[PDB]
Design a protein around this ligand. Sequence first.
Ligand SMILES: CN1C(=O)/C(=C/c2ccc(C(=O)O)cc2)c2ccc(N)cc21
Lengths: 273, 8
Amino acid sequence: PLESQYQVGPLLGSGGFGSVYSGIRVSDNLPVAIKHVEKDRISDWGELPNGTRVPMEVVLLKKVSSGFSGVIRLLDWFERPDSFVLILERPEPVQDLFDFITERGALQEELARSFFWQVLEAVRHCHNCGVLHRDIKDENILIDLNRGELKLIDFGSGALLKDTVYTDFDGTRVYSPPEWIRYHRYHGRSAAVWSLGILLYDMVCGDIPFEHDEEIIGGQVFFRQRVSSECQHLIRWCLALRPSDRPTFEEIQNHPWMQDVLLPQETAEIHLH
Amino acid sequence: RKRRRHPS
Ligand SMILES: CN1C(=O)/C(=C/c2ccc(C(=O)O)cc2)c2ccc(N)cc21
């Protein structure tokens, strides 16, 4: 049964062609998010261990589920005639990073460093599990306002991580790298690092740097807010036009701008309470 | 300046 194991509440999110409901699990009052996905609207399909053909999103969410809280946890899923239903563990109270930056403006570097660091660990976790998210952006990041813990959500554009070239893409265009714009190909890690550069500019300047293809491929980053030299260098490094010139995750986390990160609880105490 | 979401 399905409508019997979850108390179902109101729609969640900003308002788009997607369907994610707030819910509570009757078994233990666990907050859940109940995501519906129409079969006719699914890009890539995968096969589970039982050979059961499921949306790739389900495959990817299973590979990253764990006690590491940087990534949304899939707790169960159900198939229905025209759709799949995903039961996700829902933190609360939460606000997504997009609304957070809109309400607060450009973030202090201390806060952006804690947030960026936690995103880095979450993406490293995905990659260690064989999963490429492909839609890293503030809209796909939830802030647990009480614990100060960030959460990567919506794996609906992801793929299995691989070392060869990708020629397809269904993520957010303004976060996609210039090699995707110019040649419709990319490699997964360096494209992720590019989106992390867009994300970090977003955090310290209050909005993304590029809106148009010409800016994305232009190789110029104007800073619209006061930003430290160290942070500017890291951002420009992540947004190197040539993929092989971008830093690895290790190089990002060893960057001098990234030292002395706050802990989640400290982050909540100093910046979210 | 106009800040906006960007669908996938
Ligand atoms: C309050 N609030 C939530 O509890 C959310 C749970 C949420 C979790 C995972 C996915 C997903 O697709 O994996 C989608 C949604 C959520 C998402 C966006 C915004 N703005 C607010 C939210």
